[PDB]
Amino acid sequence: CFLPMSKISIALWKGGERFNQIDLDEICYGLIKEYGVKTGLKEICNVCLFPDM
Amino acid sequence: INVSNNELCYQLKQVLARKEDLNQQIISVRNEIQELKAGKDWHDLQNEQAKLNDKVKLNKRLN
Amino acid sequence: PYTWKFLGISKQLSLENGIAKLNQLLNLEVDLDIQTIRVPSDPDGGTAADEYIRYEMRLDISNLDEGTYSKFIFLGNSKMEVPMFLCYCGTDNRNEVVLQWLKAEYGVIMWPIKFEQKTMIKLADASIVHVTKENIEQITWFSSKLYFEPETQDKNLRQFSIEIPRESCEGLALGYGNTMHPYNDAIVPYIYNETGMAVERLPLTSVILAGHTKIMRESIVTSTRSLRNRVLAVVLQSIQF
Amino acid sequence: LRLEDNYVPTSDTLVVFKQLMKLPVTVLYDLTLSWFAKFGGSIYLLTETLDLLIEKGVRRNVIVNRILYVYWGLNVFQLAEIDCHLMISKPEKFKWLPSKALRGDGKPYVVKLQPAKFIENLQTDLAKIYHCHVYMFKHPSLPVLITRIQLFDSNPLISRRPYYVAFPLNSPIIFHSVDKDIYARLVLQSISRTISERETIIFKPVQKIPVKSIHNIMTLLGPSRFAESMGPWECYASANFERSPLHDYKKHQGLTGKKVMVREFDDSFLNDEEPEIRRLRLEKNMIKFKGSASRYSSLVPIEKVGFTLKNEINSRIITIKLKFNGNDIFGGLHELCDKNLINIDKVPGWLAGENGSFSGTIMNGDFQREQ
């Protein structure tokens, strides 16, 4: 291809250290695949909040 | 030899008729196989099974 | 299967006289009823140039065969330019001997009638207007199958047909409005509006209805023996000058 | 029991004489050279004999007696070559019938086949049922692959009608010769099974009415720019109206302007000299029934077309059923319009010639084909 392709990846931190990258990559890939871009990121920050569920 | 030749001619005609019938049956069975293995319902259930497996994997890892 | 050939008649004549000469030349007996019929018996005609005198010269013979059975339906009017004509069916020799007698006795001029396109349109309009005994015109419908047969270079387009089903015909008739002429006010403007093919100028060959009639350019094939009054009225109106 | 090329069938000699008399002399020379190089019978010593024969200007009868009486049928491969060269020579005799290649959900699958490994696979699939022989060559002008599939029976071997399957190079539409016997379904089903090799392909037929030549079916439904436009949109399939952006602007249709005629929109046709206006009227008919500018026949001759117009007035579905016939339908329609019998202001697009050789209905102003 020759169009400028974009890349989206996320990373977490529990204060102590970074989390594993394979499960976070699979989770963000599946969440973007299932919801979208403008909706998937809201869901991933809502699940990284995790105050209730 | 003459009467058995007439008998074998009649039986060979019956055998050729059964051979044509088995040819038609083979063609019908293989056509049903090729229509069932590439049908829309098979691909639809395949995609739905793949989506259910991906959803249960995502739900397990998110939990 | 009664193919009605059509011939013309030059001079107005009565038929009550001279029929005994046909009986003497034929050694048979024929009945010639005098029906003073009149088209659209509804009172919007003025009772002027609307009546005709019909002479159904039947041949009351043994009806074991239909090809030898031949009627002779006539028509006349004492107001138009060409007053009379006839139409005959069958394949008998009696048709030839009676046209011989008609040429010999009264001294008239006979010629076959060729059809136009608008004449065929008016015949398809008139062959479905059914007359009932309650002095009104109820209109049946038929899944008509039009036909064309043009001649082009290298026989490009040989023949092509326009077929309209019955419910579609009734829908076009009820959507146009209440009129006694569907096939010249509704369908032909609809075909011109949706296709651009003006069927008045295209070469017609066989306006065929749904097994009921078969209008051609040289004859009319029907299923029953009798022919309606408006059909012969339109035919007699067509051959005027 | 898959028959090889060295087997000879039992056919009448005079019909092969009649077939081989329909070919020129140089293709007969090429056929003799190739057959003697591959099989022979009765090196370069016998080649100069025909080289001297064709130099003297002999007729075709003495050389066809030469080829039929130095080999005395020849074999199955020689008959396949004769019949395929006869197909190349006169293409107006055959009759093709197209069929699409679907798979999976319904997305079309390009065939992308190779001529080497496909032939032995098709033969080893067909040999488990009947006696068979296949033969596959490339058309010299058009980029297609014509495969001649021949079958036999045992009352030695009575031949069948040869069945042709034409593969285009990069299209999901596969043409086969028009037949409906059980051997035709067997050959088409066997090809549908052996062309796949990774995931299964089915052959839903896209048309029911046959079409005549291979150039016509290639221009209609093969890989081509004319594959969908085909009618009044024939200008977009050749791009004769615009130039590249790197061209001159002085010779541009925006700057030069095209001579046009004012259309009429009132009903001024049913009430019926100036040769410039006559030339512009003929140019208008040429625009509507064809591209920009013999002389009546279209690009492709279409045999049979049956339309259906299902309009809707005051919630009543009013159907009509147009049917056509003849050699070239839309050319004769352009001729009938040229004699001022059809008002070209009210000729719709589907009648004009677009989606050619497709007999389908119309439901509210947009064409769709029939199965």
Residues in chain C: 241
Cβ pair B58:A47 closer than 8 A: no
Report whether D350 contacts D322 (CB < 8 A): no
**Residues 2-61, chain B: which have Cβ within 8 Å of D?**
23-24, 26-27, 30-31, 34-35, 37-38, 40, 43
Give the orientation angle of helix B40-62 with respect to helix A21-34, to 10 degrees.
130
Here the tokens at position D241 are 């109206």
Beta strands C137-139 and C72-75 are unpaired
CA D264 to each of CA C14, D126, D344, D346, D349: distance values in angstroms, whole numbers, following the listed order: 55, 63, 11, 11, 18
Backbone angles phi, psi at D182, to 5 degrees: -70, -20
Q: Enumerate neighbours of C (3 or more CB pairs within 8 A).
A: D
Q: What is the DSSP letter of C51?
A: B
β-bridge partners, D317:
D312
Here the tokens at position C144 are 């008509």
Closest Cβ–Cβ partner in D106, D129, D192 for B34: D192
Report whether C8 contacts C112 (CB < 8 A): yes
Nearest Cα to Cα of residue C95 among C36, C30, C35: C30
β-bridge partners, D146:
D137, D166
Q: How many whole angstroms separate alpha carbon B1 and alpha carbon D166?
A: 51
Residues 6+ apart with CB under 8 A from C31: C57, C58, C60
Cβ pair D104:B38 closer than 8 A: yes
Experimental method: cryo-EM
Q: What is the DSSP letter of C195?
A: T
Residue B43 touches partner A, C-beta closer than 8 Å: no
Here the tokens at position C120 are 């065929």
Closest Cβ–Cβ partner in C150, C156, C197 for D331: C156
3-state SS class at D99? strand
Beta strand extents in chain B (DSSP E only): none
Report whether A43 contacts A31 (CB < 8 A): yes
Nearest Cα to Cα of residue C93 among C70, C116, C110, C111: C70
Closest Cβ–Cβ partner in C155, C157, C201 for D333: C157
Q: Does C contact B via 3+ CB–CB distances below 8 Å?
A: no
Report whether D230 contacts D354 (CB < 8 A): yes
Resolution (A): 4.2
Give the orientation angle of helix D76-89 with respect to helix D25-38, to 10 degrees.
150
Report whether D192 contacts D202 (CB < 8 A): yes
Which residues from C are below 8 Å from D when comparing CB atoms?
A: 150, 152-165, 168, 171-172, 174-175, 190-198, 201-202
Query: How far is residue D283 CA from its own chain's centroid?
Result: 30
Cβ pair D296:C153 closer than 8 A: yes
Residues 6+ apart with CB under 8 A from C1: C66, C221, C223
A32: nearest CA partner in chain B:
B58
Report whether D189 contacts D205 (CB < 8 A): no
3-state SS class at D186? helix
Task: Compute the CA torsion angle B35, B37, B38, B39 (nearest 10 deg).
Answer: 70
Report whether D347 contacts C196 (CB < 8 A): yes
Q: What is the DSSP letter of D234?
A: G
Alpha carbon of B54: minimum distance to chain D alpha carbons (Å): 20
Residues from chain B that touch D153, judged by Cβ atoms under 8 A, are none
Q: How many whole angstroms separate alpha carbon D337 and alpha carbon C197?
A: 9
